From TrEMBL, chain C:
One of its GO terms (molecular function) is identical protein binding. It comes from the Bacteria. This is DUF4298 domain-containing protein. Pfam families: DUF4298. InterPro entries: DUF4298.
TrEMBL record, chain D:
InterPro entries: DUF4298 (IPR025384). It comes from the Bacteria. GO terms for molecular function: identical protein binding. It comes from Streptococcus pyogenes serotype M1. It holds the Pfam family DUF4298. This is DUF4298 domain-containing protein.
């Protein structure tokens, strides 16, 4: 029936409108993350380095980059993001 | 010694402050995309169905029955998968 | 106890022995696949070419046969399914590092 | 007759390549079949029980190197995936 057709299309339209910005936002966020990736590389190599440890043992006080957890947590976040991405890839592959 | 240190630190701090929100934003955007994925599944199965074609070819559609709205959405999804597959090995080397 | 320890260890040793070569073989097979990947690329681009279709409708017929109806299609299908399996495996391996 | 030349080349390319695909497929799925053994060995290595003539599984490096090999295989797989994705 025509009215079924109408309902069905209106429902799809609303579904598109709720979904599409989520796709656009992930695309944009991924791209920006990629553009700034060297900053993560720099910060990660800084944290491993002997220099970091030297500087973390100053005599004030450590809240940022020399903090106990800041950079460790950033890396933890990065690594957990990688997991989430790895879980998503096979699902996306089955919906191409 | 304690002025050169300050300058090294100030550079790192600035690097963190430029970078960290990009990480947070990607985390959040990924999660929201995941949460709404079934909507993409639904739309994708709608587009490939005979019903879509019947509905689209009736007697103009700028939405879901338009010529390329959903095609482009799938195209965008598929290109996002490619970018994700390129990013994974890079991230795997910086854990 | 020492005897019980020895039996636990023997079980692990066997587990290593059963498993280790499956790792080593996959590593070797992967590498060889990578090395020969251009052969797949060539064959794939041949199959999707207009030339393939022309040549498949000629009267040599039928070799069974790079010009066969499904040889190269199946090879691509196998490649694609291999990518799926790889994608499913990656997250599992990521949780056992 | 250009044709027969071209075909012969492809046929030879297929015959060189196809077993490399089959072998990877078969190696992958045998690795899958036996994955729980890797899991068990990995959890064994990290355990308190493990602290306890030793050249095999109780060796300094055997299990460490196995994990190292596993982890490098993952890297190689992650590199391969995007390439395969462009040739479907």
């Amino acid at each position: 029936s025509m009215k079924q057709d109408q309902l069905i299309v209106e429902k799809m339209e609303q579904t598109y409108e709720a979904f599409s910005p989520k796709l656009a936002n992930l695309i944009e966020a991924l791209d920006a993350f990629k553009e700034h990736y060297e900053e993560y590389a720099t910060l990660r190599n800084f944290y491993s380095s002997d220099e970091w440890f030297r500087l973390a043992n100053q005599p004030d006080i450590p809240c940022g980059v020399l903090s106990e957890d800041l950079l460790f947590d950033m890396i933890g976040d990065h690594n957990q993001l990688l997991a989430d991405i790895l879980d998503l890839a096979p699902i996306m592959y089955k919906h191409m």
